[PDB]
Design a protein around this ligand. Sequence first.
Ligand SMILES: OC[C@H]1O[C@@H](O[C@H]2[C@H](O)[C@@H](O)[C@@H](O)O[C@@H]2CO)[C@H](O)[C@@H](O)[C@H]1O
Ligand SMILES: OC[C@H]1O[C@@H](O[C@H]2[C@H](O)[C@@H](O)[C@@H](O)O[C@@H]2CO)[C@H](O)[C@@H](O)[C@H]1O
Lengths: 133, 133
Amino acid sequence: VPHKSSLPEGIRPGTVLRIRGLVPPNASRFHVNLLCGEEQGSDAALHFNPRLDTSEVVFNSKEQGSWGREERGPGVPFQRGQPFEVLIIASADGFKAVVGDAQYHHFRHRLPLARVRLVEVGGDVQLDSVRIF
Amino acid sequence: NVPHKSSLPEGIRPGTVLRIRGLVPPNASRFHVNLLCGEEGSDAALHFNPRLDTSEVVFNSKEQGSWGREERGPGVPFQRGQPFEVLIIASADGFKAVVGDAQYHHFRHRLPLARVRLVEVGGDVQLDSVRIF
Ligand SMILES: OC[C@H]1O[C@@H](O[C@H]2[C@H](O)[C@@H](O)[C@@H](O)O[C@@H]2CO)[C@H](O)[C@@H](O)[C@H]1O
Ligand SMILES: OC[C@H]1O[C@@H](O[C@H]2[C@H](O)[C@@H](O)[C@@H](O)O[C@@H]2CO)[C@H](O)[C@@H](O)[C@H]1O
């Protein structure tokens, strides 16, 4: 079951998204999206896309249906059949992705942080908990 | 119990996250997390003090040797013999203290974030991990 929840107040520097779950044994990909709205194809301030199928974790943003320049994290700190914990931490400069015990990648803001109003977690992932602090 | 004491010579900013994982000993009385202005009784931007003996969690600041106005959180989200996870999250306006799965208390800043240059975790606590993200 995907997570999709509204952040009508937005998120500010000091917001922490904590995701706990398990990558299923047959997983291809899953995604964490910080979106500007609920509509179809909404702009994305952050698309965080662990890809088991292609052994990469892609970061990107989306504006007017156009993806930006992809960033990739170092290695893939996810494994099929294994549980994980991700922090997505918002600062004034960007989003810090923490996986397990280590900062994994820093994605500088493209879209103003104030554009974020929705969080979505979906794809091939079993979710134990999603929290916004 | 081995305490933690580490330097933040660059300071901390909105989006800094202190994650503490540990266990409250079965005979614990109290433990503390301090964000301090320096290496010495240095000023404390945050003193986070779970007290199992008196069933309270106290928050305070200290300047020039004098404690400020105490704040207390609702209940005690710690138990002797039980493991715990605390997030101390810095925003522009204060520190969000998260325990377990929920925000426990918000402590508005008394000292500027730029003056924080040391993290201490000590007292009656067994530390499994202390991370600054
Ligand atoms: O950039 C995020 C999107 O990537 C799309 O796939 C890219 C792929 O990463 C890139 O290597 C290149 O081959 O073009 C593809 C299509 O843009 C995904 O399809 C999309 O879901 C986002 O993950
Ligand atoms: O930062 C709070 C400090 O409190 C001290 O204890 C207080 C106590 O909380 C209060 O209710 C009253 O009884 O006065 C005491 C003395 O200030 C602690 O002793 C100190 O270690 C700090 O935690």
